[model samples]
Target chain A: GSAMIEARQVSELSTRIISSVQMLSNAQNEQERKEAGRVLFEQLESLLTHIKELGGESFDSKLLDALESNVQNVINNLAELGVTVERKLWLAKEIDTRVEEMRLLSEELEQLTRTQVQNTSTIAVANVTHIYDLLEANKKDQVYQALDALVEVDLDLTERLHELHLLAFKMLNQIEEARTLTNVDRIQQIQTAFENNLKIMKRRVLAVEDPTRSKQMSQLLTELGKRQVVFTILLQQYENNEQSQQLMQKTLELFSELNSTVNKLVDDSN
Target chain B: DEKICAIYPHLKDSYWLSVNYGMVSEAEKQGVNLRVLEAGGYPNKSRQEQQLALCTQWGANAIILGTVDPHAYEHNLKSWVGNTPVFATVNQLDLDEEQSTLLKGEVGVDWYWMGYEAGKYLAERHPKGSGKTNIALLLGPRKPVTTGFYEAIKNSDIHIVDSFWADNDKELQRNLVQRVIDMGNIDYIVGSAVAIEAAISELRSADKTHDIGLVSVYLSHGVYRGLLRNKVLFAPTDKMVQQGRLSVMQAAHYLRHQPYEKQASPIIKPLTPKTLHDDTIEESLSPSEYRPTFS
Candidate 1:
């Protein structure tokens, strides 16, 4: 309830403060300047008071104190403004500074709430759709807001690429070791591990959206699927080192090709 | 030696090319390994983030990031950055106070001043009673520069007839400029250097060179040439080469535990035709023969 109240209060005060600040630069005479200044001062104090009370209830004590101190500082600074063109410019810059500070605080507050509710059933809706809205309207700050949301969602894709790449290399090394082993049991054990890893890697590879890369991965999987069992058959023959070595070489090349494909996907994504 | 990875939005223009030149020079001076990456454009935020991860994987001791957008990837910077120090360059990075503590240093002007200067110039020339001057706004998707420009002209007689938003690609800007000129109601064309450069030829061929004025928010080689030929009125330079050098130096200082300016920005200078040759332009423009350096 406090969070909702604070959000509404902050939103309302921000609108009022911004409206008053916008008028400060447009003010033509002493009367207009004084009127704008008065409204700014009133809204800022109200915002400050609300923030101060929020300090008592907020878990982020340091943030509240800092937010409160910032508004107080803005009030102190604005009180010294005089009626001159240079002073008006200074006032405009100061107002910009205060607005930006408040925005920063608001974002921090929202982030705190989002983090608090992430594990709960409560949904945290951000400006993820802002990009499309702005694109239709032809709009900046909103673009980054939307891009960040999408990027965060897509982070797993990048991570998946990396994990798949690492998996490919690990399998490559394990298969290479499988080539020189004397024991059939050990060879079969590595073969089972390789197949299990392939299945996991295959699942991850299917998540990739790139058609060319997906096709490449699919082909690698198809070849590996057919060639994986041949290793054991060759190893079972007595005095068959030459043919086994050749089979192992072909298998290693397949794994090597898999590693390269994964590596290329990672690079293309970047 | 310490390793630094520098990533830019793109090097399609001399602006970022100059920045890259500065970085490579500073990295050489400091005896450090510098690997560079480009995201191609502002819309490539995902690519930029991947490059950030690539930086850490490459064993970078520090990263110099010129982000695609100020707010892009900010929330998840820690996830990609891990323990490596990040120094922002040439564009402002909007970090929360908590996230800001994680940044080692930064080098860039607010860009608000650049827009304000462009707007203020027009505002000063045409005040409240100077008659209604219709200006077409051609800007990149970034809002702060547009906001600062509008802030300066809020009370002036200048009015916006139309606005176009696109990535700062020359051909894209050229198409926008053509449309603005074709519409035929504009008195002034104010926008990004790329857009203004596009406007210069469009105005000339449209036979409205003297009838319309052009102002660029920042300097580019074409904008600089336009200023020299009196085809463009004004622009602001933030010394991008210096920003690039500062980014590398900041990372070097932090890696070595030496004192350095945590938030450093070069002063912006408003340039008109008369002031064009007054300042050293090399600090803002890369050499004509300079090529893009990736590593």
Candidate 2:
């Protein structure tokens, strides 16, 4: 009877231990599971130690029977609990693997998002830069065009001013020749033509000064004025025919120098 | 008695001074009696209030004010003087909701647009990630105007690594630039204030010229020298002389009881460049319509 009672008590304790371990495993509570495992292991170790202390000698027949039954019951219960722990450990491993896979997927998506955003920004900045470059190029072209217009206008003015100079010089030379020959009619004709040409040149120069054309006119006026001063010196030589001839040679030289200087100025401007 | 008008928050700093110069010159051209008073550099709330009172006491018929603190003076402005029209410049003062409405009025060049311009300028010069493009901003004392510029840069993709403030202090500006150099990744430095030039000089002394670029607002003789030396890029000057002259003209036109069209704020005029070399300076270009007064 004592052996049977001890066996029943050992079986009940083992069942309770197995149930507690299962509860801990099902809850997936690491702290509780560890605590339960530790306690159970300690209890089993204590029981084994107690069994060893009992010695292989049978103190009395009834006591030996109870101890043997309790030991066998405890051992069988521990084996059942070990199987439950193994199953829980396998379940935990699967959970961990899925968690790691999800983490990697999330990181990959984030990286892809970042790459797209960066690429779009790069394209945007590039487009703006291209537009800015285009604008700068357009501005340069416009400036060049304005400069070309200025040069063309300048050349036209110089040609007109030169034509006026030649007309005045020719009239003055003809008058000197007529005076040397004592032909009053020819002198009168040349003087009349000279005055008419002067009037025409004046009209043309005045037209250039009109506000609509003033910008180009003003630019040429300074250059033309310098040429006019040279023409004035040339015109004064017509008082004596022989002196006029010498003056004419000097005037031609001046004209050549003026042309060269004007050409050089235009070239430098371009 | 002939009516006399005054514009307050005078032509002290380069920005407001530019505006005052514009108004005063315009008054002279139009033969309008106008007086301008400087409200002593970011006047405290009380000082501005007192200035307004003084203007009123002096028999000003119309007043144009750039309020230092709008909320503090809006009601006093309205109640203290009745039917005397007030025009606000720069930052709007607190006024009646209706009075404060911008209504088809363009404020000075959009700060965001300016930032975008600056960014585009820098981006063309330096592409990002080219060995850590270091950029820094030293802004004016955190006002709506200055912060708006900072926010504009922040919103852009231009990564500003370091930012400091000066609260309009010259010494603080020098210290901030030294700190930026020590940080060792600052390639471009941009700022909008009087202290900005001092900061640039500090950077130059450190022999960090190749690694740094500067963009500033307002053109002075000092700034022009820097531009000539290629230390500073073109500045966005608020041609104050033109603005002052224009303000007076506009006020005179208003006095004629003529239906006046309000000119847009910031007026969007270009500041022409001037070049100096060999002890002689040449004006390279005339401003579109506005000319800066600084020699």
Candidate 3:
């Protein structure tokens, strides 16, 4: 109840001070002027004390609003830049760096806003300048759509490579486990599946338009071509289980190497 | 555009090779210039010191280093590196407080836990009340643990019957594995990734595959494969690729005046054959065929 009365006192004090100032301005005598002036000073003193008690909380709220607005601006900038990345107007790497900057900016703002009232504005003001600079850089990169399809292309390729790696390993194990050359039919079936998948992967790689990526893909293709001859020779000589096993291991290693090459290309292109 | 110079102990194994791939991957993604070099192995302090000079000649804005020895160039580091900030990767860095300011950040876990986890895995299966078991430790030359492995097995029946120290090179580890098997009576073999990999073959060829268990203190390509085939009983990974990535990120952040973690490290995960398909495993190991990248 005391607190409520103190809050209402603000409203009452303003009206009383307005009337006192009016009396002073229109004073008919010196005594009335003196009396009104004294009362106005007293009311002003009361209001000052009230504000002194409540000032920190109020300023903290104001600072919080400022920080909240900046946070929203950063988020809005990120959204715009994200669209630019999706639209391919800017490189994915550009957006990646900005996103991290924005993330750090947001984290700083969050920490500042939650800081003790006395310390909040000092750091928050400086940090806001950093946020502005980051936002400024983000604006300079404003320059994607079909991002889903682009992502699917990567995921599809990764999945294909994963399956191919597994099949290669399966062939390796089968070749190693076979009792004799007669039981090596499963190895041929796995190799055929592996070849088909590798062909599909090659088509995907060839479809890439980037020269650097295309060059990397060519390297993978060259390895596959060279390995194919060795693979053919070993299959022809499958009468020797030892030679077949060595070729199977070699095939597995080749696919493993190819997977790394392809993945590096995919990651770099992004 | 800031130029970062990264030097490693060696690119001899996939551990450092994967770290190289990570640094290269992130440097490209972050759009920074990176020049990388290796000291060839941990034995080359002078070589690493020579590699450190190249960073200055290149006028690097920052230097990311994987030292061959933590205590090798402490006093001379400030003089050698001059004003360029240094970031440590995947290894301990020892420096005096006066020289510590030159260190901007580091990305690696305490390797003690790696040994402890390997020891604890064996200890749990062979507690004091259980049967007594013996293990041969094939720790790498620069032994990372002082007492972590001993601390874990102190209360258990597990005993360290033999200890072998060698460089993490596969051939050196292979020779040690052969010697351990020839001596025989080793109920379980606990070693580094290279040693465990060698044990996978040595134990099999000795016809003691089921008789001996294998555990690794860190993850590698062969160790990961060993886990997949149940050839390895346990191994822990500190996410070496992620460590390399974080080291670059920290250096980049510092150069860009962005806020970053000063003591960033990846969480360690203990892996068994049953838990071989962990999602975190991707960040722990590079693609099996990732070779070293010098730039």
Candidate 4:
């Protein structure tokens, strides 16, 4: 999915290139300056290629191509000043301004995915966990990909829970709440796993780049919330009624499905 | 007159009584006139409704309610306020969401976390291959509140052999535990403080103390003692008095037209025999040295 590419590797790549630019500007001697320039050139080059890769399907290629062209020009200018000691001083200075400009542009392209920019501007309105917590991870791509799978699986899990709830309710409506003599602790286990997983998924979904992922998941959540009696009541009764055992087992699978899917998504990105 | 009227579920349990103590003390210290009413227990939803009616009739400046049924107040309390702020303290208000225009403030435990802690504790104890253990699950009447513990406990190796609703009553819990005990082999008995207390006595009387494990979702003075003396295995307590103080301060905020936290969920503190501290046990009980000031 485009989420794998647009969501990650780009944030750190942006910061890494930005730091390399600062390194070039602060190099003690000409040799160090050229070495730093090579690092910056390679960082920006990979960043451009990443945007293009993410660009192929999800984002606008024309703008990203233009963004990449501008950086190519910046790289050539830095290379030109690389040859002499006098140019080294100016070269470092040029990289500072020009590289600075490319930084934002690359960041813009990196952020151009379906993800919302949920930046914690004030650092205080604290019910929300800021996206920056996951931004600079070296495993950023893997996490984003896993988070994306979680988004899909979260809804699916709820939908399954509702079905299971209906089944238990059906048993009650049909019979006098069938005597399951079932494992009473199993009810708590299903609910515990579902809720914990949902919470983890929802927390990460907030920091995820794509708004569609978060937005769709939120919609599914609201849909489930509107029909909460199914969950609240069935979860209360599922263990007591043997008739609910199958549905409980099914509902239990929904949690496992979510886990497996997240594992698959995370693994696929590698 | 600046009168504040509060309604609670019951006055017998240390939980509600301690809440009353905190609320009454805060109101007295502030020099505000306060009247409190209790429904006596969970069965009488109509009693609580009447109590709400009584608070309104008394021309209360503000109302603090520990709801018996959160849903009883749903879509029906806008007039109870009639411009005065209504605070749902301790138990949740039966509303669509906790934060609402009608409900100015809420001080309740986060049910999901409450359950998660209990479940996580059980899971940590018997990580795997312990599914054969059967727990006699005793639930209280309030479905939403009990659901918190239920959902969390399911993620573990424990199995439920049977379940019953004790309506958070001592005798009912004791009777239910007694009935279930006579029925057959039970590995564990678990419930709210009311029911768990009942279980402690019933298990002891039947001489099955060594056979079954006991756990309480939250602590009371008795359960606090249980943890201290090893009668109870575990109980997770959220700050009840802190909530009471917060509720009083919230009413104060509304009277002064000042900003206040619309949602106040106190954190959970787990108590085991090893971790149950003296200060917490003291806080959960009525001070022995104190006396009521009534003519």
Candidate 5:
């Protein structure tokens, strides 16, 4: 009776292990089109080891036959897919590098914008003197034209500032998206968001020099600063949440997979 | 002569609030006219600049600031204060020796001792050779104070199996505690700050409350309740009220031009210095030992 029960358990486990492998393979194939296949391959390797252990068990004859068949099926599927485990690792590393590249570019853009903004005030001051000189000469037409030119300059500066703002917003949104997908880690996203926001702020202050518009700029700066602080806090909290969740989920999944594999091994032995 | 004092981190937490109370009390005791202001919380560089502007506007003779963000405000604080002596409490901003000398020295309990004490407590509770004892450490935002405690643990022999940081978010605190409970290897859990309560409740809900031992730093009524119920081991008090009172006294000494000890000899610092290792708690919290005497 014990042998019969063991055989039945092995058969059930063998079927489950095979299905899991197939599911993993399908998932990896789908992921390869968009992301590196390394992580998926790692998962496959773990599953394969589990499957082999399950197939190695001795149990009732019927269960043993079923497990052996399932193990053979998984091996055949791997060969048919032509998926080398090495390729998967390479893909994972490649994706990781791409994510890092995005982060670095985001930071560089932020620094560039800030430097541009810091120099804007100097430009504005120099322009003010030229405008004053034009006015003192009683060249009414020249003065009017210069003032008009200044207005256009201001508009252009504002537009650039707005562009920086939009970029910061997009960077933050991308980070949020990446976090939700759990595709990239949270620290990288937060660092990118903070660096971008800081750049937007530095540029905003440097480029926008109209005394009349100072209040508006100040308000915007305050709001951005507050958002930066709040987002920083939120990102940290979320990272902790994500890390704890992932650890627990992985551990539990491994345990369940191990149990299933052991049963398959028993049936294969039978 | 009127002096302006700015408190950083605001009086939001009991610890800071108590410090403020002590400042005001000491100012009153010394007959010094003090204009007290709170910075809401850790202000950014611009906000600290604004604070400097406000202090200048107030015509402060001397200023005391609990820096919002360490070192970020050093240049602004110095430039704004001009000749006014600015004293920084807690963590000093990154400053040169000359720049640091412009400000009065920092005043706070030893953070490393606090963590070291907490570590020793856990080590004694679950000594080596005891069956696998999983311990979890819940931390606050990675500030100097928190880092100080963490470093103490790293230096000690306490085997911390798992650690999590809440980043000062209440929800994260609760959730991380729940996750720790779910992990099931946790035999003892210690939080570095007020969020330990959240961890306790989560453990209780998971029906593993009795199995896990818990402790945390910074005492409160909630902590008192936990202690009474035997839910928590004990909380290390910061002697916040005392620290507050002492800070005011130090400021007064500086003001009087009297020969105040540049540094308090024997340190007489908070017992849970550096890290609140487990052993420090018993030594520091004893009724006769350095108690909060806020008369």
Candidate 6:
């Protein structure tokens, strides 16, 4: 209730997002392009969530349609992408599957459980799952149109996260099956924290109200925040710490696939 | 009523956009009728060649071409220019016409040194063949600009395990880097400002800032910020906006039978404290402080 974006705010933000997309398309330098693109999607992600918290229930076709077409413009650029770097839009199921797999692999690897790890896989996965519920209630693209009845099953993003939770428990099983904690402080935490980022981002993405507008679920389909957003704080801290840098990069890649997919749904819908 | 024709590789790139900025602004000042056309990309060599032919068809007083494919110099030039004084701007080219006919001038910087400098920096730090260092080279076309850098890296023990030809596209470069980093062995990445900038963020986000080094081959506003952040290892600039202005002036001189260097390459300024302190790098930028301008 405290946070809200008005109709005009919606207009200004979308135009800003579109302009950023244009910058992304026009940008030749890899870093600048990624930064500009990250800004575009970040704004869109904020818009999607803000709309839901503030106005998604009312169902304004004007704002909704405008977001759809603008995001559609971004999706359309993906098709025009030239050269070997063109990526396929991601499947949301695959997103859950990958997060599931990373932790499943956690049995043997067991790296992210360290005390240094502030955010854990448990926290991340649970957060994402919870956000998914709220988002589901808010109705993801749920009310974009009467188009809801067109689908027979109620996916509601529930089963995937439940299926995702099963994947998380499997990693915990690997640890429980050991009958003893891996005696190391850093590696155990580091082991579990490996996918902790993906968990958080997936969660952040879930907090998003509409599937109809956004940036990328992961670092692949889109380079959002990977360039600029991810760095401003660390660079400020001069965190120049080696492990964190690699960890952060890997973390950025986690939700891109889902981000890319949800965005495609909107674009393809239009 | 002088007519000048300008042909470039693509309008999508800021490099060409800067060149266009110069041409458009200069044409306004010179009062010469100007026509500009850009082919889509290097893959569109035939299209650029045809656009060159159309230059004559349209009756140009002089033609300034920033070739799409470097190969255009070999296959696209001949009596085809039809007596128009043609000046090559922005990209390097050599006319392969019969001895009597060729491009009257070339205005651009050769970026080979940008690579050589990056290689030299790595060689000094890692001591090629002495220390084991793996590099990921993100690049555009496998042309002089990028290949020159790769060849230099080869002279050292540093191994290039991942190399991609992104053609100066930032999104592609980011993807290329993202795919390689999971291996966790990359020591350095030498590429354009775009790739380096993207890498800086990825590396930072991944907590690999201390693990990897980023060097951009040229300057841009993003890289400038990266430099201030100490995220980029080094950035070399050819003063693009300056080159944009200079290319037109060179063409203007050629058309007037005025004396100008038939071949010109700007002095290279590798970003360093000296240049930054003196505002040399700051001056090379676009828009407010500097942009391609005729006056």
| lDDT by residue (tens digit), candidate 2, A3-85 | 33333333344444545444544444456667777677765665454444332323455444554554555455455555555
In candidate 4, what are the lDDT values of residues A38-112, reduced to their tens digit? Answer: 787687677667655554543444444544554454444444333333343543344344434433322222221
Docking class of 6: incorrect
- Mark the 10 consecutive residues where model 2 chain B has the least summed lDDT: B278-287
Query: Which candidate number has the best lDDT?
Result: 1
lDDT of 3 by residue, A137-224 (tens): 5753321222333335434444544443343344334333322223346546645654675565456555643343344444544454
Q: What lDDT is reached at residue B118 by model 6? A: 69
The residue-level lDDT of candidate 3 at A167 comes to 38
Model 5 collision count: 37
Please give, for residues B124-188, the per-residue lDDT of candidate 3 as tens digits.
88999898898888987854453788888999899888798888666799999888887777888
Interface RMSD of each: 19.5, 21.1, 22.8, 24.4, 26.3, 22.2
Model 2: how far is B293 from its true place, Å?
A: 13
Give the DockQ (C-alpha) for candidate 4.
0.00
Candidate 4 per-residue lDDT over residues B138-221, each given as its tens digit? 767635545665676666677777778747657778888887787676777777777877787787888887776778777666
What is the TM-score of chain A, computed separately for every candidate? 0.35, 0.29, 0.25, 0.27, 0.39, 0.24
- The TM-score obtained by model 4 is 0.48
Write model 5 residue lDDT over A1-270, tens digit each, in one string: 144454455445444544443343334444542333344355456555555444444545665566555545544544433343234334444444544444434433343333334334223433444555466678889878767755687447746755764665566455444423332355556656656666665566555544423443444444444444333434444553454344334433544444454555554445
**Positional deviation of B46 in candidate 3, in angstroms?**
1.2
Listed in order, each prediction's TM-score against the native is 0.51, 0.44, 0.52, 0.48, 0.46, 0.47
Q: What overall lDDT, based on C-alpha atoms, would model 1 receive against the true structure? A: 0.68
Residues A234-260, model 6: lDDT tens digits: 222222223234333332332233234
Q: lDDT tens digits, residues A58-176, model 1?
A: 44544545554555544543443323323544434443443344333223222222222221111011122224346667777767766764556444444545566566666666655
lDDT of 1 by residue, B33-75 (tens): 8988776556667768888998999999999989888888567
Candidate 1: CAPRI quality band: incorrect
In terms of lDDT, the poorest run of 10 residues in model 5 chain A is A113-122
Q: Is candidate 4 or candidate 5 better by TM-score?
A: 4
